[PDB]
């Protein structure tokens, strides 16, 4: 091994480990495809 501490390989979706479409806003760290399943149980609701 030889580690990389920054950029794409430093992070993932916490739920699915995929590296794509990740919401890091408010430090959620979930990809939106996973997040839209759970956003209600997380406590969000859409209105607009």
């Amino acid at each position: 091994v030889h580690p990389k501490k920054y950029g794409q390989g430093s992070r993932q979706c916490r739920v699915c480990s995929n590296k794509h479409a990740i919401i890091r806003k408010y430090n959620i760290n979930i990809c939106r495809q996973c997040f839209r399943e759970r956003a209600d149980i997380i406590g969000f609701k859409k209105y607009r």
Binding site: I23, K25, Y26, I28, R32, Q33, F35, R36, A39, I42, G43, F44, K45, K46, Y47, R48
Partner: protein
């Protein structure tokens, strides 16, 4: 005493409870101060593969903060707080008064 919640009804229920609670020991209160609402807004694309018309929907987690404060000794307010609690709301006690 600061009250933070994501649920309107629960925070309002706590408001009525604290108003009664204050009058039980006949305390001198400043009226409940509702602090500016923070909304945790996520504007989210619909489709897991990004299909069709682009199509975004806007999700909101809206948290309510309120503060009600009291000029009273430290023991009285903490004991009042412990009788007044319910699980859902987040309570912070900042009173050093006498």
């Amino acid at each position: 005493i600061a009250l933070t919640s994501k649920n309107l009804r629960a925070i309002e229920k706590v408001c009525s409870d604290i108003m009664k609670g204050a009058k039980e020991k006949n305390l001198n209160v400043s009226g409940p101060v509702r602090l500016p609402v923070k909304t945790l807004r996520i504007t989210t694309r619909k489709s897991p593969c990004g299909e069709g018309t682009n199509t975004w929907d806007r999700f909101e987690l809206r948290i309510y903060k309120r503060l009600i404060d009291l000029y009273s000794q430290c023991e009285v307010v903490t004991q009042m707080t412990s009788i007044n609690i319910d699980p859902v709301v987040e309570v912070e006690v900042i009173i050093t008064d006498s």
